[PDB]
PDB file of C-alpha atoms and ligand atoms in Angstrom:
ATOM      1  CA  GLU A   1     -79.929  78.930  -2.552  1.00 18.91           C
ATOM      2  CA  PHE A   2     -81.274  77.942  -6.113  1.00 19.85           C
ATOM      3  CA  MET A   3     -78.129  77.291  -8.500  1.00 17.79           C
ATOM      4  CA  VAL A   4     -78.527  77.480 -12.227  1.00 19.46           C
ATOM      5  CA  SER A   5     -76.468  75.337 -14.540  1.00 22.35           C
ATOM      6  CA  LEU A   6     -73.067  76.338 -15.676  1.00 25.62           C
ATOM      7  CA  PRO A   7     -72.856  76.744 -19.283  1.00 28.50           C
ATOM      8  CA  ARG A   8     -70.647  74.787 -21.370  1.00 30.12           C
ATOM      9  CA  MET A   9     -66.860  75.202 -20.830  1.00 30.08           C
ATOM     10  CA  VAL A  10     -63.610  73.616 -22.726  1.00 29.48           C
ATOM     11  CA  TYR A  11     -61.101  72.843 -20.246  1.00 30.99           C
ATOM     12  CA  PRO A  12     -58.370  69.617 -19.584  1.00 29.51           C
ATOM     13  CA  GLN A  13     -60.057  66.508 -18.190  1.00 32.60           C
ATOM     14  CA  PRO A  14     -59.135  65.611 -14.579  1.00 29.53           C
ATOM     15  CA  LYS A  15     -57.043  62.984 -14.306  1.00 31.07           C
ATOM     16  CA  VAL A  16     -57.968  60.552 -11.748  1.00 32.62           C
ATOM     17  CA  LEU A  17     -54.951  58.779 -11.331  1.00 30.98           C
ATOM     18  CA  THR A  18     -52.738  61.634 -11.438  1.00 30.75           C
ATOM     19  CA  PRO A  19     -52.240  63.565  -8.460  1.00 28.71           C
ATOM     20  CA  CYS A  20     -52.594  67.371  -7.999  1.00 31.38           C
ATOM     21  CA  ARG A  21     -49.420  67.632  -5.887  1.00 30.19           C
ATOM     22  CA  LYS A  22     -46.982  65.520  -4.757  1.00 30.30           C
ATOM     23  CA  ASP A  23     -45.191  67.337  -2.285  1.00 28.26           C
ATOM     24  CA  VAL A  24     -47.629  68.845  -0.506  1.00 29.64           C
ATOM     25  CA  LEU A  25     -51.022  67.927   1.489  1.00 30.19           C
ATOM     26  CA  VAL A  26     -54.004  68.811  -0.422  1.00 28.01           C
ATOM     27  CA  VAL A  27     -56.711  67.622   2.002  1.00 26.09           C
ATOM     28  CA  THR A  28     -57.598  67.675   5.444  1.00 28.10           C
ATOM     29  CA  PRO A  29     -58.455  64.698   7.611  1.00 29.36           C
ATOM     30  CA  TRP A  30     -62.233  66.070   7.649  1.00 29.22           C
ATOM     31  CA  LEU A  31     -62.262  66.626   4.055  1.00 28.11           C
ATOM     32  CA  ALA A  32     -61.735  70.285   3.769  1.00 29.23           C
ATOM     33  CA  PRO A  33     -59.787  71.121   0.688  1.00 29.85           C
ATOM     34  CA  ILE A  34     -56.176  72.852   1.436  1.00 28.47           C
ATOM     35  CA  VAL A  35     -55.664  75.763  -1.270  1.00 31.76           C
ATOM     36  CA  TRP A  36     -52.772  75.550  -3.330  1.00 28.82           C
ATOM     37  CA  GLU A  37     -51.818  76.907  -6.546  1.00 29.01           C
ATOM     38  CA  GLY A  38     -52.066  73.271  -8.845  1.00 30.78           C
ATOM     39  CA  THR A  39     -55.529  72.488  -7.047  1.00 29.02           C
ATOM     40  CA  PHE A  40     -58.239  74.309  -8.762  1.00 24.87           C
ATOM     41  CA  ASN A  41     -59.501  75.766 -11.959  1.00 24.58           C
ATOM     42  CA  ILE A  42     -60.146  79.243 -11.505  1.00 24.44           C
ATOM     43  CA  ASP A  43     -62.639  79.431 -14.404  1.00 24.58           C
ATOM     44  CA  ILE A  44     -65.017  76.821 -13.298  1.00 25.39           C
ATOM     45  CA  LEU A  45     -65.065  78.789  -9.611  1.00 29.41           C
ATOM     46  CA  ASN A  46     -65.427  82.110 -11.113  1.00 26.92           C
ATOM     47  CA  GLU A  47     -68.738  80.629 -12.986  1.00 27.92           C
ATOM     48  CA  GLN A  48     -69.780  79.080 -10.114  1.00 25.52           C
ATOM     49  CA  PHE A  49     -70.016  82.036  -7.640  1.00 22.58           C
ATOM     50  CA  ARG A  50     -70.585  85.023 -10.507  1.00 22.33           C
ATOM     51  CA  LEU A  51     -74.037  83.030 -10.804  1.00 23.53           C
ATOM     52  CA  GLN A  52     -74.488  83.685  -7.274  1.00 23.91           C
ATOM     53  CA  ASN A  53     -73.961  87.121  -7.754  1.00 24.65           C
ATOM     54  CA  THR A  54     -71.687  86.584  -4.899  1.00 26.51           C
ATOM     55  CA  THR A  55     -70.184  89.825  -2.629  1.00 27.18           C
ATOM     56  CA  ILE A  56     -67.332  89.450  -0.646  1.00 28.59           C
ATOM     57  CA  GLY A  57     -66.497  92.079   2.205  1.00 28.50           C
ATOM     58  CA  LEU A  58     -63.071  92.503   2.955  1.00 27.75           C
ATOM     59  CA  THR A  59     -62.218  94.280   6.575  1.00 29.84           C
ATOM     60  CA  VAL A  60     -59.385  95.711   7.916  1.00 30.10           C
ATOM     61  CA  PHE A  61     -58.650  97.674  11.003  1.00 27.98           C
ATOM     62  CA  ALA A  62     -56.252 100.822  10.668  1.00 29.81           C
ATOM     63  CA  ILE A  63     -55.144 102.486  13.600  1.00 29.31           C
ATOM     64  CA  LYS A  64     -52.636 104.862  14.507  1.00 33.20           C
ATOM     65  CA  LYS A  65     -49.480 104.647  12.358  1.00 34.66           C
ATOM     66  CA  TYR A  66     -51.256 101.593  10.461  1.00 36.60           C
ATOM     67  CA  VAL A  67     -52.976 103.884   8.321  1.00 39.87           C
ATOM     68  CA  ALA A  68     -49.929 104.749   6.190  1.00 40.38           C
ATOM     69  CA  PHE A  69     -50.348 101.249   4.937  1.00 40.32           C
ATOM     70  CA  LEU A  70     -54.348 101.394   3.475  1.00 41.33           C
ATOM     71  CA  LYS A  71     -52.846 103.035   0.027  1.00 43.17           C
ATOM     72  CA  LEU A  72     -50.419  99.917  -0.936  1.00 40.31           C
ATOM     73  CA  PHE A  73     -52.771  97.434   0.525  1.00 41.63           C
ATOM     74  CA  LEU A  74     -56.274  98.926  -1.293  1.00 41.17           C
ATOM     75  CA  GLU A  75     -54.490  99.642  -4.305  1.00 42.31           C
ATOM     76  CA  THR A  76     -53.028  96.288  -4.867  1.00 42.95           C
ATOM     77  CA  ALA A  77     -56.403  94.237  -3.684  1.00 41.79           C
ATOM     78  CA  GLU A  78     -57.780  96.003  -6.570  1.00 37.13           C
ATOM     79  CA  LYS A  79     -55.246  94.389  -8.948  1.00 32.51           C
ATOM     80  CA  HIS A  80     -55.686  90.873  -6.960  1.00 30.63           C
ATOM     81  CA  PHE A  81     -58.538  90.581  -5.046  1.00 32.03           C
ATOM     82  CA  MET A  82     -61.597  88.749  -5.755  1.00 30.60           C
ATOM     83  CA  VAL A  83     -61.298  90.975  -9.398  1.00 30.26           C
ATOM     84  CA  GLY A  84     -64.558  90.190 -11.673  1.00 32.67           C
ATOM     85  CA  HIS A  85     -66.878  89.926  -8.117  1.00 30.16           C
ATOM     86  CA  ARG A  86     -68.481  92.577  -6.070  1.00 32.23           C
ATOM     87  CA  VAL A  87     -66.160  93.611  -3.088  1.00 30.62           C
ATOM     88  CA  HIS A  88     -67.108  95.945  -0.216  1.00 31.90           C
ATOM     89  CA  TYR A  89     -63.912  96.875   1.631  1.00 31.53           C
ATOM     90  CA  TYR A  90     -64.649  97.714   5.359  1.00 32.15           C
ATOM     91  CA  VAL A  91     -61.828 100.130   6.128  1.00 28.00           C
ATOM     92  CA  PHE A  92     -62.008 100.477  10.199  1.00 29.47           C
ATOM     93  CA  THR A  93     -59.949 103.561  11.605  1.00 28.70           C
ATOM     94  CA  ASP A  94     -59.188 105.853  14.461  1.00 26.84           C
ATOM     95  CA  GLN A  95     -58.450 108.366  11.207  1.00 26.31           C
ATOM     96  CA  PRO A  96     -61.102 108.419   8.934  1.00 26.10           C
ATOM     97  CA  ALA A  97     -59.978 111.812   7.358  1.00 27.97           C
ATOM     98  CA  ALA A  98     -56.474 109.876   6.403  1.00 27.83           C
ATOM     99  CA  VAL A  99     -57.953 107.137   4.472  1.00 27.89           C
ATOM    100  CA  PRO A 100     -56.686 107.570   0.917  1.00 32.53           C
ATOM    101  CA  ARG A 101     -58.571 108.116  -2.086  1.00 37.10           C
ATOM    102  CA  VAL A 102     -57.999 104.508  -4.044  1.00 40.09           C
ATOM    103  CA  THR A 103     -59.812 104.567  -7.564  1.00 40.86           C
ATOM    104  CA  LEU A 104     -62.069 101.205  -7.570  1.00 42.00           C
ATOM    105  CA  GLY A 105     -62.972  99.071 -10.373  1.00 40.83           C
ATOM    106  CA  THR A 106     -66.303  98.679 -11.425  1.00 40.85           C
ATOM    107  CA  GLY A 107     -68.680  97.138  -8.747  1.00 42.82           C
ATOM    108  CA  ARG A 108     -66.283  97.578  -5.842  1.00 45.97           C
ATOM    109  CA  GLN A 109     -66.921  99.937  -2.890  1.00 44.90           C
ATOM    110  CA  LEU A 110     -65.636 100.999   0.114  1.00 44.39           C
ATOM    111  CA  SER A 111     -66.845 102.087   3.741  1.00 43.77           C
ATOM    112  CA  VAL A 112     -64.685 103.984   6.284  1.00 41.24           C
ATOM    113  CA  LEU A 113     -66.064 102.776   9.286  1.00 41.87           C
ATOM    114  CA  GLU A 114     -64.528 105.376  12.449  1.00 40.17           C
ATOM    115  CA  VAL A 115     -63.730 103.567  15.854  1.00 44.33           C
ATOM    116  CA  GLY A 116     -62.918 104.815  18.756  1.00 41.37           C
ATOM    117  CA  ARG A 117     -75.973  93.067  10.944  1.00 39.05           C
ATOM    118  CA  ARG A 118     -75.105  95.517   8.624  1.00 39.74           C
ATOM    119  CA  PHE A 119     -72.639  92.413   7.194  1.00 41.09           C
ATOM    120  CA  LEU A 120     -74.975  90.404   6.764  1.00 40.76           C
ATOM    121  CA  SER A 121     -77.529  92.008   4.824  1.00 36.93           C
ATOM    122  CA  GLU A 122     -74.775  93.819   2.384  1.00 37.18           C
ATOM    123  CA  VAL A 123     -72.325  90.819   1.997  1.00 37.41           C
ATOM    124  CA  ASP A 124     -72.343  87.062   1.684  1.00 36.07           C
ATOM    125  CA  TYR A 125     -68.624  86.367   2.886  1.00 34.94           C
ATOM    126  CA  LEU A 126     -66.537  88.256   4.882  1.00 37.17           C
ATOM    127  CA  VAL A 127     -62.763  88.238   5.157  1.00 40.28           C
ATOM    128  CA  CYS A 128     -60.595  89.520   7.732  1.00 40.73           C
ATOM    129  CA  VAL A 129     -57.076  90.606   6.968  1.00 41.83           C
ATOM    130  CA  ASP A 130     -54.080  92.614   8.370  1.00 41.31           C
ATOM    131  CA  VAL A 131     -53.641  95.929   6.771  1.00 39.81           C
ATOM    132  CA  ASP A 132     -49.614  96.275   6.194  1.00 36.81           C
ATOM    133  CA  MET A 133     -49.657  93.596   3.504  1.00 37.58           C
ATOM    134  CA  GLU A 134     -50.022  93.841  -0.202  1.00 40.80           C
ATOM    135  CA  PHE A 135     -51.846  91.781  -2.547  1.00 39.89           C
ATOM    136  CA  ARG A 136     -48.749  90.055  -5.053  1.00 40.41           C
ATOM    137  CA  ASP A 137     -51.232  87.368  -6.768  1.00 41.01           C
ATOM    138  CA  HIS A 138     -54.378  86.318  -7.325  1.00 38.52           C
ATOM    139  CA  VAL A 139     -56.834  85.880  -4.395  1.00 36.61           C
ATOM    140  CA  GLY A 140     -60.175  84.989  -5.716  1.00 38.57           C
ATOM    141  CA  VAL A 141     -63.203  82.751  -5.053  1.00 36.85           C
ATOM    142  CA  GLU A 142     -60.958  79.558  -4.695  1.00 36.35           C
ATOM    143  CA  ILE A 143     -60.838  80.534  -0.940  1.00 36.45           C
ATOM    144  CA  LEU A 144     -64.474  81.076  -0.612  1.00 39.78           C
ATOM    145  CA  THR A 145     -66.017  78.565   2.075  1.00 36.63           C
ATOM    146  CA  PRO A 146     -68.306  78.924   5.238  1.00 36.74           C
ATOM    147  CA  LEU A 147     -65.037  79.002   7.408  1.00 37.28           C
ATOM    148  CA  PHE A 148     -61.155  79.495   6.205  1.00 34.62           C
ATOM    149  CA  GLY A 149     -57.959  79.509   8.052  1.00 36.00           C
ATOM    150  CA  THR A 150     -54.613  80.090   6.431  1.00 36.71           C
ATOM    151  CA  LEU A 151     -51.581  78.282   7.581  1.00 35.30           C
ATOM    152  CA  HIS A 152     -49.262  80.408   9.534  1.00 34.89           C
ATOM    153  CA  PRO A 153     -45.811  80.673   6.961  1.00 38.18           C
ATOM    154  CA  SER A 154     -43.367  80.133   9.727  1.00 37.75           C
ATOM    155  CA  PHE A 155     -44.587  76.996  10.694  1.00 36.96           C
ATOM    156  CA  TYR A 156     -46.380  74.898   8.051  1.00 37.55           C
ATOM    157  CA  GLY A 157     -43.690  72.345   8.461  1.00 33.66           C
ATOM    158  CA  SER A 158     -43.488  72.069  12.180  1.00 33.15           C
ATOM    159  CA  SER A 159     -44.542  69.546  14.453  1.00 34.70           C
ATOM    160  CA  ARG A 160     -47.205  70.261  16.415  1.00 35.22           C
ATOM    161  CA  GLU A 161     -45.564  69.968  20.033  1.00 35.18           C
ATOM    162  CA  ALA A 162     -43.402  73.113  18.320  1.00 34.10           C
ATOM    163  CA  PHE A 163     -46.457  75.287  17.668  1.00 35.70           C
ATOM    164  CA  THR A 164     -47.302  78.448  19.827  1.00 32.60           C
ATOM    165  CA  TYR A 165     -50.431  77.294  20.725  1.00 32.89           C
ATOM    166  CA  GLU A 166     -51.719  78.575  24.203  1.00 32.54           C
ATOM    167  CA  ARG A 167     -50.261  76.224  27.178  1.00 29.76           C
ATOM    168  CA  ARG A 168     -51.458  76.910  30.405  1.00 26.83           C
ATOM    169  CA  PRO A 169     -54.077  75.099  31.233  1.00 27.18           C
ATOM    170  CA  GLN A 170     -55.801  77.765  32.652  1.00 24.15           C
ATOM    171  CA  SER A 171     -56.558  79.437  29.538  1.00 25.73           C
ATOM    172  CA  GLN A 172     -59.546  79.062  27.641  1.00 25.56           C
ATOM    173  CA  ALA A 173     -57.078  78.988  24.890  1.00 24.11           C
ATOM    174  CA  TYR A 174     -55.332  75.973  26.002  1.00 21.93           C
ATOM    175  CA  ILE A 175     -54.277  73.483  23.630  1.00 22.93           C
ATOM    176  CA  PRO A 176     -52.106  70.279  25.154  1.00 23.05           C
ATOM    177  CA  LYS A 177     -49.348  68.743  23.540  1.00 21.47           C
ATOM    178  CA  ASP A 178     -51.076  65.792  21.627  1.00 21.72           C
ATOM    179  CA  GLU A 179     -53.554  68.087  19.909  1.00 21.20           C
ATOM    180  CA  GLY A 180     -53.808  70.283  16.912  1.00 22.36           C
ATOM    181  CA  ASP A 181     -54.251  70.006  13.859  1.00 21.65           C
ATOM    182  CA  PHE A 182     -52.059  73.146  12.190  1.00 19.07           C
ATOM    183  CA  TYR A 183     -50.828  76.508  12.927  1.00 20.25           C
ATOM    184  CA  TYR A 184     -53.419  79.204  11.238  1.00 23.17           C
ATOM    185  CA  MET A 185     -52.668  83.175  11.702  1.00 23.32           C
ATOM    186  CA  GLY A 186     -54.753  85.091  12.550  1.00 23.79           C
ATOM    187  CA  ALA A 187     -53.601  88.042   9.452  1.00 24.96           C
ATOM    188  CA  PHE A 188     -56.255  86.002   6.944  1.00 24.82           C
ATOM    189  CA  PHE A 189     -59.305  84.250   7.723  1.00 23.69           C
ATOM    190  CA  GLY A 190     -62.741  84.285   6.698  1.00 21.21           C
ATOM    191  CA  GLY A 191     -66.001  82.713   5.691  1.00 19.40           C
ATOM    192  CA  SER A 192     -69.771  83.457   5.236  1.00 17.23           C
ATOM    193  CA  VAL A 193     -70.890  86.665   7.458  1.00 17.41           C
ATOM    194  CA  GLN A 194     -72.801  83.789  10.132  1.00 19.22           C
ATOM    195  CA  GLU A 195     -69.519  81.880  10.898  1.00 18.18           C
ATOM    196  CA  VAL A 196     -67.369  84.636  11.037  1.00 20.58           C
ATOM    197  CA  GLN A 197     -69.956  86.166  13.609  1.00 20.01           C
ATOM    198  CA  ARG A 198     -69.804  82.998  15.280  1.00 16.80           C
ATOM    199  CA  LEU A 199     -65.785  82.728  15.352  1.00 16.31           C
ATOM    200  CA  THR A 200     -65.556  86.351  16.571  1.00 18.48           C
ATOM    201  CA  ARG A 201     -68.203  86.146  19.038  1.00 17.01           C
ATOM    202  CA  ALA A 202     -66.319  82.856  20.614  1.00 19.04           C
ATOM    203  CA  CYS A 203     -63.045  84.656  20.853  1.00 15.89           C
ATOM    204  CA  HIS A 204     -64.493  88.056  22.450  1.00 20.12           C
ATOM    205  CA  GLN A 205     -65.855  85.736  25.188  1.00 18.26           C
ATOM    206  CA  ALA A 206     -62.829  83.170  26.007  1.00 18.21           C
ATOM    207  CA  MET A 207     -60.937  86.445  25.895  1.00 20.36           C
ATOM    208  CA  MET A 208     -62.922  87.843  28.373  1.00 21.19           C
ATOM    209  CA  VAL A 209     -62.974  84.972  30.748  1.00 20.52           C
ATOM    210  CA  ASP A 210     -59.164  85.156  30.447  1.00 19.37           C
ATOM    211  CA  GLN A 211     -59.132  88.337  31.575  1.00 18.87           C
ATOM    212  CA  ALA A 212     -61.552  87.735  34.315  1.00 17.28           C
ATOM    213  CA  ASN A 213     -58.784  84.921  35.531  1.00 18.72           C
ATOM    214  CA  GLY A 214     -55.887  87.260  35.153  1.00 20.15           C
ATOM    215  CA  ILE A 215     -54.457  85.493  32.280  1.00 17.25           C
ATOM    216  CA  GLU A 216     -53.269  87.031  28.749  1.00 13.08           C
ATOM    217  CA  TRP A 217     -49.868  85.091  20.978  1.00 14.91           C
ATOM    218  CA  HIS A 218     -53.132  86.280  22.247  1.00 14.63           C
ATOM    219  CA  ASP A 219     -55.187  86.655  18.857  1.00 13.15           C
ATOM    220  CA  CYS A 220     -53.586  83.944  17.669  1.00 13.28           C
ATOM    221  CA  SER A 221     -53.975  81.925  20.429  1.00 12.63           C
ATOM    222  CA  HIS A 222     -57.843  82.354  20.438  1.00 12.53           C
ATOM    223  CA  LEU A 223     -58.318  81.555  16.910  1.00  9.67           C
ATOM    224  CA  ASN A 224     -56.250  78.462  16.990  1.00  8.59           C
ATOM    225  CA  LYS A 225     -58.573  76.807  19.616  1.00 10.19           C
ATOM    226  CA  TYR A 226     -61.834  77.912  17.825  1.00  9.46           C
ATOM    227  CA  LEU A 227     -60.430  76.337  14.726  1.00  8.63           C
ATOM    228  CA  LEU A 228     -59.351  73.200  16.278  1.00 10.00           C
ATOM    229  CA  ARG A 229     -62.705  72.448  17.814  1.00 11.76           C
ATOM    230  CA  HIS A 230     -64.748  74.076  14.660  1.00 15.19           C
ATOM    231  CA  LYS A 231     -62.837  72.553  11.574  1.00 13.75           C
ATOM    232  CA  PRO A 232     -62.142  74.752   8.915  1.00 13.38           C
ATOM    233  CA  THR A 233     -64.112  74.002   5.515  1.00 13.75           C
ATOM    234  CA  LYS A 234     -61.159  74.914   3.572  1.00 11.14           C
ATOM    235  CA  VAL A 235     -57.495  75.388   5.119  1.00  9.18           C
ATOM    236  CA  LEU A 236     -55.305  78.092   2.485  1.00  9.25           C
ATOM    237  CA  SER A 237     -51.835  77.250   2.153  1.00 10.50           C
ATOM    238  CA  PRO A 238     -48.759  79.629   2.841  1.00 12.78           C
ATOM    239  CA  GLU A 239     -48.909  81.420  -0.761  1.00 10.97           C
ATOM    240  CA  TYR A 240     -52.059  83.229   1.204  1.00 13.08           C
ATOM    241  CA  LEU A 241     -50.082  84.777   3.972  1.00  7.81           C
ATOM    242  CA  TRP A 242     -46.310  85.068   3.261  1.00  9.22           C
ATOM    243  CA  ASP A 243     -43.144  87.226   4.358  1.00  7.63           C
ATOM    244  CA  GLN A 244     -40.413  86.891   1.389  1.00  7.60           C
ATOM    245  CA  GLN A 245     -38.252  88.764   3.424  1.00  8.58           C
ATOM    246  CA  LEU A 246     -38.124  86.614   6.032  1.00  7.65           C
ATOM    247  CA  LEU A 247     -38.579  83.236   4.866  1.00  6.78           C
ATOM    248  CA  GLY A 248     -37.529  83.456   0.660  1.00  7.28           C
ATOM    249  CA  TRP A 249     -39.008  81.637  -1.954  1.00  8.50           C
ATOM    250  CA  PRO A 250     -39.394  77.886  -1.524  1.00  9.69           C
ATOM    251  CA  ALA A 251     -40.192  75.578  -4.177  1.00  8.63           C
ATOM    252  CA  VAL A 252     -43.417  74.234  -2.760  1.00  7.14           C
ATOM    253  CA  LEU A 253     -44.780  77.542  -3.220  1.00  7.91           C
ATOM    254  CA  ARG A 254     -45.603  78.586  -6.882  1.00  8.02           C
ATOM    255  CA  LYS A 255     -47.191  81.793  -6.266  1.00  7.92           C
ATOM    256  CA  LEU A 256     -46.694  84.356  -3.639  1.00 10.24           C
ATOM    257  CA  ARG A 257     -50.054  85.765  -3.124  1.00 10.08           C
ATOM    258  CA  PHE A 258     -50.686  88.418  -0.527  1.00 10.84           C
ATOM    259  CA  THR A 259     -47.339  89.045   1.772  1.00 11.93           C
ATOM    260  CA  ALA A 260     -45.843  91.274   4.467  1.00  9.23           C
ATOM    261  CA  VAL A 261     -44.536  94.780   3.656  1.00  8.08           C
ATOM    262  CA  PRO A 262     -40.789  94.845   3.732  1.00  8.72           C
TER     263      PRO A 262
HETATM  264 HG1   HG B 301     -54.765  69.091 -10.262  1.00  7.66          HG
HETATM  265 HG1   HG B 302     -63.753  90.466  10.332  1.00  7.82          HG
HETATM  266 HG1   HG B 303     -60.507  92.684  10.121  1.00  9.26          HG
HETATM  267 HG1   HG B 304     -61.987  81.400  20.100  1.00  9.96          HG
HETATM  268 HG1   HG B 305     -60.113  84.740  16.937  1.00  6.06          HG
END
């Protein structure tokens, strides 16, 4: 779409001969940024996305006992997720009446969809996350792109042969030992509505094929196969999907933004 000029802004000059980070990879081999603290100026990005009147959809499934995680999830999203931008939460649940009444900031809305094209007209981007989580620091427009995945926090330092991809050749999710860029976790992915729908359609079909052939990480295996074959346009660092009880707070993580609930 047509993009208006940015206003005058005052910020430190980028330093061509100073790397952002010397401890981590900040760009994939297909030139997608890998999003770590210290790589982005959020004021620039906020301007760019507000000038497009960007709306972000946040989708969460909360079935059976998982409804209990909604209150903390939504309260913390209010403090940390896309603050200043238009947000539409979509809570898919078998217990609509048990969704807690959480107070939202202006320009933010929540829809409860009961489970046993709306997204295209309502939001620009869709972000798909697990509900048994809390935001502890900024998660903002720096993630937005046509298609993103997030590095699994248990495997970011692992060699690809150790990745727990699907290794049975009979599965549609099969990845051999000599293939793989990263191990992505399904607990946080997203993109444009069109790209997220492409992904979820592909995954659903591959899973149907495997079921027909008698074969069943499941969600993570199919995601990982899709993102191998359709490279994400941004990758989120493990700042964006962490478990402090399991993994601590290593020096490489400057912020812990979205985490497991103890
Ligand atoms: Hg930098
Ligand atoms: Hg989704
Ligand atoms: Hg989702
Ligand atoms: Hg897939
Ligand atoms: Hg998937």
